[PDB]
RNA sequence: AAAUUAUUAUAUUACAGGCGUUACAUUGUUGUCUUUAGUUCGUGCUGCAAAGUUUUAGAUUAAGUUCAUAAACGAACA
């Protein structure tokens with residue numbers, strides 16, 4: 636919340652990054668400006684299926700998240 | 702403009718007809734049982750590879766009954 640980031644506390648689905656289109660394509664994306672405010676522009680179906688890859692991954696328990 | 706064509710009857714010959722054979726040559730239908738949370742496809746992942754996809758020989762119910770879970774995640778039909 637304080638970094639405007641994302642988190643996963645329940646389970647890492649194997650393939651979330653390598654098989655992203657079969658796992659995360661259905662979920663909604665949004666466009667934001669430099670102030671992190673939603674632009675409200677409707678997204679083309681092309682832009683809503685593209686993989687959205689994290690720029691940085693922080694892992695609290697790496698021994699259980701190989 | 703008497704020949705043509707229609708119908709009908711008769712005749713003619715290819716045949717028609719056959720509960721004749723063959724359900725073990727067939728269409729279709731039906732009887733009986735059984736498997737029917739199972740197949741294939743897509744992507745991902747493991748193994749040099751043929752292959753495998755792993756927890757799990759999960760829990761629960763009279764029973765897929767209901768639920769949980771795993772490097773797997775979906776889709777499609779059963």
Ligand SMILES: [K+]
Nearest residue numbers: 723724725726
């Ligand atoms: K017979």
Ligand SMILES: [K+]
Nearest residue numbers: 743744745754
């Ligand atoms: K496969």
Ligand SMILES: [Mg+2]
Nearest residue numbers: 716717718719
């Ligand atoms: Mg005959």
Ligand SMILES: [Mg+2]
Nearest residue numbers: 718719720721
């Ligand atoms: Mg007879």
Ligand SMILES: [Mg+2]
Nearest residue numbers: 747748749750
């Ligand atoms: Mg290989």
